[PDB]
């Protein structure tokens, strides 16, 4: 196998605090009601008000804003646990429950121009207009293969290494068995996730007059892919990160940045 963490104090504390916040039953059950509503509506993305989160635990709010990936993963674990506690079958139906953010971001609320490298790995709420969109493509998150020669059925999993170090091993699609038996993929059994890329440009009525406009690339995934079309004045709340380059040998030190959207809103 490999390294497996046992006592991650920070992760345990984050999960405990997020589950305490999501309990909400004594705190007039606002997020309890929201979780129940999403359960009924058959949704798997909870939108959390950062203002309420800060009011409950300013420490957790700051940690989430300044450390996006870790705290979002902890929040999603807590949300999945809460969803299982309220209703186990739905939790088992949906593998991962996502968390998007909303509310008043003191300094993190920026535009494509003011969005600088100081916000990398942070939660940023960027306003703008969608200059272009891409076709919704499916990325395989879990492929299933069947071997006619041996009747075996294997299942490979691919992790979401969009903004993480990725190696050729993780992104190799099996095409033979260990004995060189051709495989056949079971598309129906396989798990795909819809993925789209949009471009957010600073609103012309907001951009400094006479200058060229500033843009940013945004990545949308399952349940957020088709939330906008070109010309939409959208607010994208997401995590700003550097996209890994291809395996090189010489690096120029230049890193394309992108916004992994965790929530999209229209006017």
């Amino acid at each position: 196998a490999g390294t497996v963490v046992l006592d991650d104090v920070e992760l345990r504390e984050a999960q405990r605090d997020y589950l305490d916040f999501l309990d909400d039953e004594e705190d007039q059950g606002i997020y309890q009601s929201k979780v129940r509503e999403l359960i009924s509506d058959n949704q798997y993305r909870l939108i959390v008000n950062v203002n309420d989160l800060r009011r409950k635990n300013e420490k957790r709010a700051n940690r989430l804003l300044n450390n996006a990936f870790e705290e979002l993963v902890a929040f999603q674990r807590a949300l999945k646990d809460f969803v299982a506690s309220i209703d186990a079958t739905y939790a088992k139906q949906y593998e991962e429950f996502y968390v998007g953010l909303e509310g008043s971001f003191g300094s993190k609320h920026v535009s494509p121009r003011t969005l600088t490298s100081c916000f990398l790995s942070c939660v940023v709420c960027v306003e703008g207009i969608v200059t272009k969109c891409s076709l919704v493509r499916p990325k395989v998150v879990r492929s299933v293969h069947y071997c006619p020669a041996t009747k075996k059925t294997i299942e490979r999993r691919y992790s979401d290494l969009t903004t993480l170090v990725a190696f050729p091993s993780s992104s190799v699609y099996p095409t033979k068995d260990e004995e060189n038996n051709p495989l056949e993929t079971e598309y129906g059994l396989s798990v795909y996730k819809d993925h789209q890329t949009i471009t957010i440009q600073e609103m012309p009525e907001k951009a400094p007059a006479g200058q060229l406009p500033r843009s940013v690339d945004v990545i949308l995934d399952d349940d957020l892919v088709d939330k906008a079309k070109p010309g939409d004045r959208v607010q994208v709340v997401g995590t700003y990160r550097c996209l890994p380059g291809k395996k090189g040998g010489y690096t120029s030190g230049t890193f394309r940045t992108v916004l992994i959207a965790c929530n999209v809103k229209q006017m």
């Binding site: 007059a209 006479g210 200058q211 060229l212």
Partner: protein, 223 residues
């Protein structure tokens, strides 16, 4: 560069006929047109710019406009001023000039370099712009020349360049009258084919009329 030069030019100035000497020395290859040569001498030597406080700018440039029927050496006058004056740039109302009146920003054809090509009005910031065929200019050229003459500045708002760069040139223009023959029956404004605001910014307006005068024709043919 002027040591014995500066020694002798003072004596030439004290000569006491230096004004007439200069007026006769302008355009030695052009016969007659003493008034035009005198105006060109005054334009070449220029005036004195001033600005009460920093709020009442007044130009010190003597603008000249030679409006004349064909065969009157307006082009030769402009070319001589190009040859003599330092920082003298020749542009034409047509599109067949190396430079143009209006400034743009583009990648240069030869240098392949993204360059802010300022106009022929700016390439003579402290010199002379010789605008031939002044009556045959585009709308953008007319607006650019209006801006330069009235403001002595050129404003670009093109790609991301929002700038205002100074063009304090002296404009010597050549033009033809409506119909190709100046008619004194009508006034200069309605003879020249130019807007009144454009005309107003000219200090000297040389009406180069052509008439069939025996002696003048004989002397010009001799020359």
């Amino acid at each position: 560069l002027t040591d014995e030069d500066v020694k002798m030019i003072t004596s030439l100035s004290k000569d006491q006929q230096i004004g007439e000497k200069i007026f006769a020395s302008i355009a030695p290859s052009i016969y007659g047109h003493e008034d035009i040569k005198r105006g060109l001498a005054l334009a070449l030597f220029g005036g004195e710019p001033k600005n009460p406080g920093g709020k009442h700018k007044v130009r010190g440039d003597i603008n000249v406009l030679l409006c004349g029927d064909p065969g009157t050496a307006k082009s030769q006058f402009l070319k001589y001023i190009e040859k003599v004056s330092s920082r003298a740039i020749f542009t034409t109302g047509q599109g067949a000039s190396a430079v143009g009146l209006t400034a743009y920003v583009q990648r240069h054809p030869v240098s392949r370099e993204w360059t802010l090509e300022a106009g022929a009005l700016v390439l003579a910031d402290r010199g002379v712009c010789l605008i031939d065929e002044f009556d045959k200019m585009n709308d953008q050229d007319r607006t650019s020349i209006h801006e330069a003459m009235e403001q002595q500045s050129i404003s670009i708002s093109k790609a991301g360049i929002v700038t205002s760069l100074q063009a304090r040139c002296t404009v010597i223009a050549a033009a033809n009258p409506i119909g190709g023959r100046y008619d004194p029956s009508l006034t200069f404004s309605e003879n020249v084919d130019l807007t009144e605001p454009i005309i107003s910014r000219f200090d000297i307006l040389c009406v180069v009329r052509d008439t069939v005068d025996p002696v003048q024709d004989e002397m010009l043919a001799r020359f």
